[PDB]
Amino acid sequence: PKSACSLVKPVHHLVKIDKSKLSPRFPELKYDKSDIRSPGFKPKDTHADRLNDHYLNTLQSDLLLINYSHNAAVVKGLKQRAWSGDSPYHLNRPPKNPRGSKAQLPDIHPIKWSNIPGLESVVINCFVREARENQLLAITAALQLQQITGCKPHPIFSKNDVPTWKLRKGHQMGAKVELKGKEMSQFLSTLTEIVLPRIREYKGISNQSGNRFGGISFGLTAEDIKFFPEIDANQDSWPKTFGMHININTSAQLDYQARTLLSGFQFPFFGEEK
Amino acid sequence: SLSPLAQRVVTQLSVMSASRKQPKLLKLAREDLIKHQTIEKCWSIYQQQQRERRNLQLELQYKSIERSMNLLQELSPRLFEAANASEKGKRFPMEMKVPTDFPPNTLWHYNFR
Amino acid sequence: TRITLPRRPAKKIQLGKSRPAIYHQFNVKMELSDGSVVIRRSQYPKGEIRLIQDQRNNPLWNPSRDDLVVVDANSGGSLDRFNKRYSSLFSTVELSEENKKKTQ
Amino acid sequence: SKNSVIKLLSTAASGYSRYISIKKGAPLVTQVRYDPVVKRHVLFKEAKKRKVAERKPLDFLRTA
Amino acid sequence: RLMWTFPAYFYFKKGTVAEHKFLSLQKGPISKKNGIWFPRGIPDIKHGRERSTKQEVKLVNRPVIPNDRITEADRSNDMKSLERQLSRTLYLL
Amino acid sequence: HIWSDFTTRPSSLSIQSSKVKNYLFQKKASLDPPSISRRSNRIKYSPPEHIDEIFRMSYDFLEQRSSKFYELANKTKNPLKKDALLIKAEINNPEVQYNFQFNNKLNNVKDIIDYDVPVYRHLGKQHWESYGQMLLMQRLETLAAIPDTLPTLVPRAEVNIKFPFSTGVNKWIEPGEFLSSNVTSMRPIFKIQEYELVNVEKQLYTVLIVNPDVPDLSNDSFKTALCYGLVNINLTYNDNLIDPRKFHSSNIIADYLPPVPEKNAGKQRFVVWVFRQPLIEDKQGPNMLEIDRKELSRDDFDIRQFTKKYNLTAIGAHIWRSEWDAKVAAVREKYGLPPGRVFSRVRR
RNA sequence: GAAAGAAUUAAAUUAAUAUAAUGGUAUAACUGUGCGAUAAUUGUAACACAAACGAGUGAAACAAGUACGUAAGUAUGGCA
RNA sequence: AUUGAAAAAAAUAAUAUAUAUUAUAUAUAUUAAUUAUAAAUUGAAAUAUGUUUAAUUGAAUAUAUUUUAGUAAUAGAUAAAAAUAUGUACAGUAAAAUUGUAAGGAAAACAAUAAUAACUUUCUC
Ligand SMILES: [Mg+2]
Ligand SMILES: [Mg+2]
Numbered sequence A: 001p002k003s004a005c006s007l008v009k010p011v012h013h014l015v016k017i018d019k020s021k022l023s024p025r026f027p028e029l030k031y032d033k034s035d036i037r038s039p040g041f042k043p044k045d046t047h048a049d050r051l052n053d054h055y056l057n058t059l060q061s062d063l064l065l066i067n068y069s070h071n072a073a074v075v076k077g078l079k080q081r082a083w084s085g086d087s088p089y090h091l092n093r094p095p096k097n098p099r100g101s102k103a104q105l106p107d108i109h110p111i112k113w114s115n116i117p118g119l120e121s122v123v124i125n126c127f128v129r130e131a132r133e134n135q136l137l138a139i140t141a142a143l144q145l146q147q148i149t150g151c152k153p154h155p156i157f158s159k160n161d162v163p164t165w166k167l168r169k170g171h172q173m174g175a176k177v178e179l180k181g182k183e184m185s186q187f188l189s190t191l192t193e194i195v196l197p198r199i200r201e202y203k204g205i206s207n208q209s210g211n212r213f214g215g216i217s218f219g220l221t222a223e224d225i226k227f228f229p230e231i232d233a234n235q236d237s238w239p240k241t242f243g244m245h246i247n248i249n250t251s252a253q254l255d256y257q258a259r260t261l262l263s264g265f266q267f268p269f270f271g272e273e274k
Numbered sequence B: 001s002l003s004p005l006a007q008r009v010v011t012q013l014s015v016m017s018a019s020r021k022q023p024k025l026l027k028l029a030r031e032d033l034i035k036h037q038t039i040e041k042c043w044s045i046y047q048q049q050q051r052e053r054r055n056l057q058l059e060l061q062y063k064s065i066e067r068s069m070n071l072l073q074e075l076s077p078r079l080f081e082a083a084n085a086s087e088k089g090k091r092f093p094m095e096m097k098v099p100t101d102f103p104p105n106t107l108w109h110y111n112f113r
Numbered sequence C: 001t002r003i004t005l006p007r008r009p010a011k012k013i014q015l016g017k018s019r020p021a022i023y024h025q026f027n028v029k030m031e032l033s034d035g036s037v038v039i040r041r042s043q044y045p046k047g048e049i050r051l052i053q054d055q056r057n058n059p060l061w062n063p064s065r066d067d068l069v070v071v072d073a074n075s076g077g078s079l080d081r082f083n084k085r086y087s088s089l090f091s092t093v094e095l096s097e098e099n100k101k102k103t104q
Numbered sequence D: 001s002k003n004s005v006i007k008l009l010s011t012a013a014s015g016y017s018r019y020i021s022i023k024k025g026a027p028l029v030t031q032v033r034y035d036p037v038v039k040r041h042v043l044f045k046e047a048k049k050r051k052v053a054e055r056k057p058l059d060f061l062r063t064a
Numbered sequence E: 001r002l003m004w005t006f007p008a009y010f011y012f013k014k015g016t017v018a019e020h021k022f023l024s025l026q027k028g029p030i031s032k033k034n035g036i037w038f039p040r041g042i043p044d045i046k047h048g049r050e051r052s053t054k055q056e057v058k059l060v061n062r063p064v065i066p067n068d069r070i071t072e073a074d075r076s077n078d079m080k081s082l083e084r085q086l087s088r089t090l091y092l093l
Numbered sequence F: 001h002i003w004s005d006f007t008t009r010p011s012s013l014s015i016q017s018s019k020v021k022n023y024l025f026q027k028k029a030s031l032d033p034p035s036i037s038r039r040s041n042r043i044k045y046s047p048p049e050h051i052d053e054i055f056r057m058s059y060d061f062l063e064q065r066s067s068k069f070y071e072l073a074n075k076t077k078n079p080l081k082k083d084a085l086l087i088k089a090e091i092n093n094p095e096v097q098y099n100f101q102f103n104n105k106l107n108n109v110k111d112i113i114d115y116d117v118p119v120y121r122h123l124g125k126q127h128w129e130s131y132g133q134m135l136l137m138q139r140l141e142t143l144a145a146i147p148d149t150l151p152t153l154v155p156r157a158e159v160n161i162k163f164p165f166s167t168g169v170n171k172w173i174e175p176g177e178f179l180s181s182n183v184t185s186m187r188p189i190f191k192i193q194e195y196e197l198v199n200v201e202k203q204l205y206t207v208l209i210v211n212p213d214v215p216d217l218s219n220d221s222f223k224t225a226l227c228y229g230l231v232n233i234n235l236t237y238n239d240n241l242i243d244p245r246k247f248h249s250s251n252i253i254a255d256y257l258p259p260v261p262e263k264n265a266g267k268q269r270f271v272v273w274v275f276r277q278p279l280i281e282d283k284q285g286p287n288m289l290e291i292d293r294k295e296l297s298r299d300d301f302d303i304r305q306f307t308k309k310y311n312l313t314a315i316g317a318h319i320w321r322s323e324w325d326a327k328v329a330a331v332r333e334k335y336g337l338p339p340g341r342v343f344s345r346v347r348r
Numbered sequence G: 001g002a003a004a005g006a007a008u009u010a011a012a013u014u015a016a017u018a019u020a021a022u023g024g025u026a027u028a029a030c031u032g033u034g035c036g037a038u039a040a041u042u043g044u045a046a047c048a049c050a051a052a053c054g055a056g057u058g059a060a061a062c063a064a065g066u067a068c069g070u071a072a073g074u075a076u077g078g079c080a
Numbered sequence H: 001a002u003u004g005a006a007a008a009a010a011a012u013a014a015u016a017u018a019u020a021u022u023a024u025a026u027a028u029a030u031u032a033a034u035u036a037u038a039a040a041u042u043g044a045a046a047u048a049u050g051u052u053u054a055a056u057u058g059a060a061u062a063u064a065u066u067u068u069a070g071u072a073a074u075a076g077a078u079a080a081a082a083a084u085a086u087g088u089a090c091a092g093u094a095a096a097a098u099u100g101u102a103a104g105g106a107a108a109a110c111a112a113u114a115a116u117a118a119c120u121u122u123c124u125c
């Protein structure tokens, strides 16, 4: 190679060129995944969704009313500070970090008819630490996820080398899955309706849980996983079962709004709130 | 030479895999392709109208909230402050359950506590 | 010391030929403690199931109701035998006889 | 030291050859390159016989 | 139509009564045999399904009998009972 | 039921094949797809279940929407709004979609795809923008046809070119393609498809083919030559194939001279530009313009000055490439041009 | 008023670069991916940089053949 | 072509046949496959003459031939876990820190953390 010097030549027109349409290659990837001609086609709306219908029919209006605040205004977040131009050395100086944080934080807008909180995704994390010695437990965990949820699990691979825990790097330690729409609706419905009621001593979810910008996380143990219908039906095929974390990601601007939304979906809360 | 545990997990990962389980590709005539296109366009338009009707209802409700708040502010500040008091810790009743697709034996409960 | 099953040469799934994963599921009916029924998608070949303990009979989810009976699995373990074994004593007489101890 | 030398010879019976280094146990090398005598790209294989390392064939049509 | 084959080999173990009865319930596909003409196409079966068509599987223990969605209040047009519409939202006037 | 009406709606908004019409609008799944010609394959085929009644209901829904759009269109006055409402009314028609998707869009047949109709015009615009326009712009940019000849281009018409008289074979030239001297010896024919609202009864077009690569030894550089030029040409949405049938000698400001590159003179680019003349109001009849032929250079051309002077706006373009071969001498002799020059192999 | 796009702006080269340190890199030189495994080929090499010599470094252009690319073109080993 | 059934079609592309051009083009025809590849007495299917059986039919037995089961990860132009360190084409953006989450703690794995004025298509008052 004569040189390593990236440089994009400017154009003389405003027409946007996508070369995937000019290449005769990959004819079947030109169709959208929603197009019946695409091999990636998968029917989406096969049946009505009770949880979504309930949220659209009842909870949107109630949440709007509850979160209404008169003459509210946007609360801007911690952003990068700017150097005052009292010294020449400030001319090309990069901006300063936010006051309390090394990362910028989002602004909080008043709740209005267009931005009511709602569920956007659910992610299940299953990290079998005992899979460090046995790689097959990862496959078992993936099957547990597939049976509980119905979606394709994705493997989790070790990234750090910690000797005290005897954790190497590049090995399969478990599985994950992300849920949206009817599938997450079903997963949450079955959780609340079957599994959580069958836990020994269950008070709810901690009121001091969740990332500070919307999203609530809580865990389940192996005995708790045994309550799901699929496992109970064929106990024989489940000598061992694994726990997992559950992360519910919503549109809530702050965590307490998400807590109210989940309580609407019947998720109990026990601790004292921040 | 494999262990019975190996066979069990291979069966589990067989349930995982797509090998020898998927049917042939769905190939539709031109006329049926056009039919399907019309179905999808109709459904998309319909869902957009439903979403926009809900959005309009919420817009109107929010307008009502703000009009009422202005009136109450100018009429009685005490009641206005009581109303504007935050509900940060609010939770829904625990029997406001999500509807199911067939009703229970006791439709409604006429006694409490 | 670790045990792993060997990796076979992965079949190449070409660009545009990659299909989605649609596992086989059944429209299974699920009966709660009350008479309510929910239709759901399950991969187990069981079209019908009923639950003995679930949301509809849990105090935490049912605060308003006055009376709420609880139950567990049947024909398993030695449950309820601590009552079946003693027939002479039966249900308010014991409550009255448990008035006080008179000890100090 | 750890690397050896090899004489790749052209397939066309022209006597042309080119030399390359290779690891002590690397698989037998063959490569298409220009052959000025015949004026085209032709194949080049080993000249002598080398002790190549043995690698298992891949499990391709599923066995057992 | 685009659904995967049911992996019965995992949900029913070898030689068990459940497996036997499930097989009895199910109806097998048509296998390809030389010397015959198959107008709809030579069968292509893997794991017991013809890949060109959908696959149909038939399946204190009393059967689930759902409750009617229409109530005595529905039929009697009672304007006061809190059952006049189990699927709609009622409002007190 | 406005889509079943054809009193005022053009007849092209319907599938001209009775079999396919009946199958698409069938009541019960008793017919078979006309697309599958062989009966065997027809028996093998199996349409998706529960597809005709959902189709009927979706048809009814879309047709009610189209009826509302027609109601508002019959009352709108501004022509742009009228055209937009017509497009929105007929865009979702299964018959229109069938016709456009599965019939020729270049050599269109008036009774299937009529470009007098706003919906067909809009669908054609979308189809062109999908693939054809992007390729044209890529070729122009990469071959440096834009800055060399004209500052920019905002494509608004599809231009196709062909060389039918030269050899006898039929081929639309891909942009940027290399053509033999024999292929480009005789004359090109153009096809300018317009997709916007333009007054067919007043608008006039010009076409200039120029070569901005003819070497010039006075300053050791290149210069531009006007290969071909036509002015005062009128088109129609469905009859827009320019050829010696559709223009006179008065339209020709520079008769066609062929691509005749010189040996080792490099790869020359022949670029086609289509402009639309000014559209004066308050006057009846097309506004024809006279070209100053004693000022036209024809060998030291300045296209930017030409278009600026005559107030022309480009709407379409095309390009091909040429290089020396053995037939160049024959072409020179046939056209009465002097023997070609021969330049050195090295650029020093 | 609302969705879905196209993206734009601020920040970032502190991660990563096969290997020290320095310079460079998001337009990526970093990372993922499809072909491919071809340029980790052949005969002339101007002209420069560097330079006592001997050596070293960048490389236009002509010719022969390859791989990738719709094309423009890129590749005479590795960001230096 | 046969095969449940009374003029023929008018697109991109792919395949078959053929011939125009010192032009990888045109005409007619059709619309296949797209997760596969040896080796299985033993699991499961479909195919005949007795059969019991009611014109059938049927369900069950016996054999000949064939089919399925070798059950194996990526389903995404995958994108900062580990594996191909040289070419080309397409595409993307890391890292720390903070807040949470079963075992989980400083340290394992997942999720969240800057701004939408302007421009389009669609829906709607
Ligand atoms: Mg390097
Ligand atoms: Mg550095």
Ligand SMILES: [Mg+2]
Binding pocket: none
């Ligand atoms: Mg010097």
Ligand SMILES: [Mg+2]
Binding pocket: G051
């Ligand atoms: Mg020297």
Ligand SMILES: [Mg+2]
Binding pocket: none
């Ligand atoms: Mg490189």
